[PDB]
Amino acid sequence: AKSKNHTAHNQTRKAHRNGIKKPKTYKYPSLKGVDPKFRRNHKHALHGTAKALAAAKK
Amino acid sequence: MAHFKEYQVIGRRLPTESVPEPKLFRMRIFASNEVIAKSRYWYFLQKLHKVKKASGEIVSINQINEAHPTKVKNFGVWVRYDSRSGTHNMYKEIRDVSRVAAVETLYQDMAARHRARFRSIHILKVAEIEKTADVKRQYVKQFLTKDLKFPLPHRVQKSTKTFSYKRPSTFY
């Protein structure tokens, strides 16, 4: 009892039903996988300029 | 292809900055309407020059009425055609009263005798035959003897009712 082995027949039919959704885009993406030494210092950078701006409404 | 008209068609590779006013070439085309005729124009132009409709432009498309449309004329016709086994050149002679009427019947003969459909046929030249005894083929030469007459025997008359009460007579 052999039977069929493989086909991509009808698979693009299915994939197009509910879409092929575009990849979605966000302002402010994630820092995931960014260099750690950069992020460490950059954590302190935002902290600093955060503090300066509360000192701008003191 | 239908009932034929004859067109003069004129086109020319699109002007370029460095080559404006290109050369203009004409063809006389036998087609049934002006759209087929420009399709045909481009068909042959691409068989000679580097052009295609995409890069060229039709300049003028003009019907050419028969100069003497009640003057019986002996035509010689030159044609390229592909048959099943290959492609060949012919010369036939049509005795009709206008180029367009004769190109029509050429196409009938090619279809009847050599099974060539319209696509397989290139009119190369159609021209009036000035002197008699330049007429070559005999199926024409027959009709140029002096004081010519001939009867039409076995006359058949298209009945208009289903029955008949005589019994016909093919007399003429």
């Binding site: 299915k14 994939a15 197009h16 039903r17 509910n18 879409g19 092929i20 959704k21 575009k22 990849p23 979605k24 993406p29 995931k32 996988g33 960014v34 260099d35 | 004129i10 020319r12 006013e21 050369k23 203009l24 070439f25 004409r26 063809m27 006389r28 042959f44 132009l45 068989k47 000679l48 432009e57 300049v59 030159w78 390229r80 492609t87 060949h88 050149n89 290139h122 009119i123 190369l124 030249k125």
Partner: protein, 159 residues
């Protein structure tokens, strides 16, 4: 059995360009990449380390990370019926700056000028791009240019 190794099928994909083997020229390492740059991926067969997978060949993406010898490029590979986010760690030899944005930039600065100079003139701008319109009318001259009549040619062989 079947074979499906990491560089399977890349015989010509990772070949080197004709008479262009050898060391990579020194500008490839003088180019500078910043977060946000649009880059094109084309793997260099001679540099095995830090090489993209064959799938990311010919693929364009955005850098998200800049390391010692490398750039992080995120790319949207579409698996299934959707796109996923893929971050790649390429080395500078396999990446290159995409001119796909130059036309845009060349058109932005130009658009600002066309707008400032027109505003400081008296409005009337029109600076969207329009497709190719059909040709206008024209009168072509016959002078020195009579139509050369053509006919199809008969059949020959010449062999």
């Amino acid at each position: 059995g079947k074979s499906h190794g990491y560089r399977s099928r890349t015989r010509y994909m990772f070949q080197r360009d004709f008479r262009k083997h050898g060391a990579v020229h020194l500008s490839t390492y003088l180019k500078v990449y910043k977060v946000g740059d649009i880059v094109d991926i084309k793997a260099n067969g001679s540099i095995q380390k830090g090489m993209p997978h064959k799938f990311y060949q010919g693929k364009t993406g955005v850098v998200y990370n800049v390391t010692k010898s490398s750039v992080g490029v995120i790319i949207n590979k579409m698996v299934g019926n959707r796109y996923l986010e893929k971050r790649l760690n390429l080395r500078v030899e396999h990446i290159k700056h995409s001119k796909c944005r130059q036309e845009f930039l060349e058109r932005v600065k130009a658009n600002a000028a066309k707008r400032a100079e027109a505003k400081a003139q008296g409005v009337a701008v029109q600076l969207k791009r329009q497709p190719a319109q059909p040709r206008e009318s024209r009168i072509v001259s016959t002078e020195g240019n009579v139509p050369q009549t053509l006919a199809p040619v008969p059949y020959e062989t010449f062999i």
